[PDB]
Design an enzyme around this catalytic site. Structure first.
Site, PDB file in Angstrom:
ATOM      1  N   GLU A 160      25.771  -3.424 -18.698  1.00  0.00           N
ATOM      2  CA  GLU A 160      27.079  -2.970 -19.092  1.00  0.00           C
ATOM      3  C   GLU A 160      26.995  -1.752 -20.048  1.00  0.00           C
ATOM      4  O   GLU A 160      27.688  -0.791 -19.873  1.00  0.00           O
ATOM      5  CB  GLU A 160      27.859  -4.110 -19.774  1.00  0.00           C
ATOM      6  CG  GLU A 160      28.405  -5.243 -18.909  1.00  0.00           C
ATOM      7  CD  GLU A 160      29.335  -4.858 -17.724  1.00  0.00           C
ATOM      8  OE1 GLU A 160      29.892  -3.760 -17.721  1.00  0.00           O
ATOM      9  OE2 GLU A 160      29.518  -5.669 -16.784  1.00  0.00           O
TER      10      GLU A 160
ATOM     11  N   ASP B 285      41.974   2.946 -12.746  1.00  0.00           N
ATOM     12  CA  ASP B 285      43.291   2.405 -13.018  1.00  0.00           C
ATOM     13  C   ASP B 285      43.863   2.781 -14.379  1.00  0.00           C
ATOM     14  O   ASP B 285      44.935   2.284 -14.735  1.00  0.00           O
ATOM     15  CB  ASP B 285      43.283   0.864 -12.848  1.00  0.00           C
ATOM     16  CG  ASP B 285      42.623   0.105 -14.023  1.00  0.00           C
ATOM     17  OD1 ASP B 285      41.940   0.697 -14.859  1.00  0.00           O
ATOM     18  OD2 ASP B 285      42.795  -1.120 -14.108  1.00  0.00           O
TER      19      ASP B 285
ATOM     20  N   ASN C 241      38.269   3.543 -16.493  1.00  0.00           N
ATOM     21  CA  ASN C 241      38.399   3.076 -15.124  1.00  0.00           C
ATOM     22  C   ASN C 241      39.430   3.879 -14.390  1.00  0.00           C
ATOM     23  O   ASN C 241      40.292   4.509 -15.005  1.00  0.00           O
ATOM     24  CB  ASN C 241      38.760   1.603 -15.136  1.00  0.00           C
ATOM     25  CG  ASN C 241      37.738   0.773 -15.896  1.00  0.00           C
ATOM     26  OD1 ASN C 241      38.054  -0.074 -16.747  1.00  0.00           O
ATOM     27  ND2 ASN C 241      36.515   1.024 -15.605  1.00  0.00           N
TER      28      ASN C 241
ATOM     29  N   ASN D 292      37.562  -4.993 -21.149  1.00  0.00           N
ATOM     30  CA  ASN D 292      38.541  -4.117 -20.510  1.00  0.00           C
ATOM     31  C   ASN D 292      39.913  -4.212 -21.178  1.00  0.00           C
ATOM     32  O   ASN D 292      40.375  -5.305 -21.525  1.00  0.00           O
ATOM     33  CB  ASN D 292      38.596  -4.436 -19.024  1.00  0.00           C
ATOM     34  CG  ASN D 292      39.537  -3.561 -18.275  1.00  0.00           C
ATOM     35  OD1 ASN D 292      40.705  -3.882 -18.125  1.00  0.00           O
ATOM     36  ND2 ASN D 292      39.062  -2.466 -17.829  1.00  0.00           N
TER      37      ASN D 292
ATOM     38  N   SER E 177      42.592   2.039 -17.306  1.00  0.00           N
ATOM     39  CA  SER E 177      42.059   1.152 -18.287  1.00  0.00           C
ATOM     40  C   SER E 177      40.704   1.699 -18.815  1.00  0.00           C
ATOM     41  O   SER E 177      40.148   2.687 -18.265  1.00  0.00           O
ATOM     42  CB  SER E 177      41.917  -0.269 -17.743  1.00  0.00           C
ATOM     43  OG  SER E 177      40.879  -0.396 -16.779  1.00  0.00           O
TER      44      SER E 177
ATOM     45  N   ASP F 281      36.889   0.330 -20.644  1.00  0.00           N
ATOM     46  CA  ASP F 281      35.956  -0.728 -21.041  1.00  0.00           C
ATOM     47  C   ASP F 281      35.233  -0.317 -22.333  1.00  0.00           C
ATOM     48  O   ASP F 281      34.837   0.847 -22.478  1.00  0.00           O
ATOM     49  CB  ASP F 281      34.904  -0.950 -19.960  1.00  0.00           C
ATOM     50  CG  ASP F 281      35.496  -1.414 -18.638  1.00  0.00           C
ATOM     51  OD1 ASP F 281      36.584  -2.030 -18.593  1.00  0.00           O
ATOM     52  OD2 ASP F 281      34.846  -1.176 -17.625  1.00  0.00           O
TER      53      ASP F 281
END
Ligand SMILES: *ON1[C@@H]2CCC[C@H]1CC(=O)C2
EC number: 3.2.1.17
Length: 129
Positions: A35, A48, A46, A59, A50, A52
């Site tokens: 990660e 969308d 992301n 998220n 969003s 992380d």
């Protein structure tokens, strides 16, 4: 902060992640490795909209507030910036909620694709825990 392998394993264990929801410490370390490469300040946007955050790339759509994720929840009730700290407490606390949500560690797509079913114990080999 960029953690050492054994160094993180030790902080995870201290914060009660080892065998949390039945996932051994090696699972948690491998997840962190793919990660964030162990970097507490890791961010990744992301498609969308969003983002992380942190060692375990939590998220903003569900779990934390960053003020720019239209239609998000903040289920860990935490600013996402709190997840970027040298101290992993907030991340660990939030991960506990994520991993209890019903899909176990599959919630971390990189754990599913890169850790699931592998010799996760290699991640904690050599460590004084
Ligand atoms: O965190 N997720 C869950 C599923 C839909 C998108 C976001 C927000 C939410 O309500 C729960």
């Amino acid at each position: 902060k960029v953690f050492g392998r054994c160094e993180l394993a030790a902080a995870m264990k201290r914060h009660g992640l080892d065998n949390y929801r039945g996932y051994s410490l090696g699972n948690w370390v491998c997840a962190a490795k793919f990660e964030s490469n162990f970097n507490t300040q890791a961010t990744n946007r992301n498609t969308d909209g969003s983002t992380d955050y942190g060692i375990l790339q939590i998220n903003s759509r569900w779990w934390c507030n960053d003020g720019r994720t239209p239609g998000s929840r903040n289920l860990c009730n935490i600013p996402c910036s709190a997840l970027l700290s040298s101290d992993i407490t907030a991340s660990v606390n939030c991960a506990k909620k994520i991993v209890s949500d019903g899909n176990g560690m599959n919630a971390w797509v990189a754990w599913r694709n890169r850790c699931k079913g592998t010799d996760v114990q290699a991640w904690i080999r050599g460590c004084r825990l």
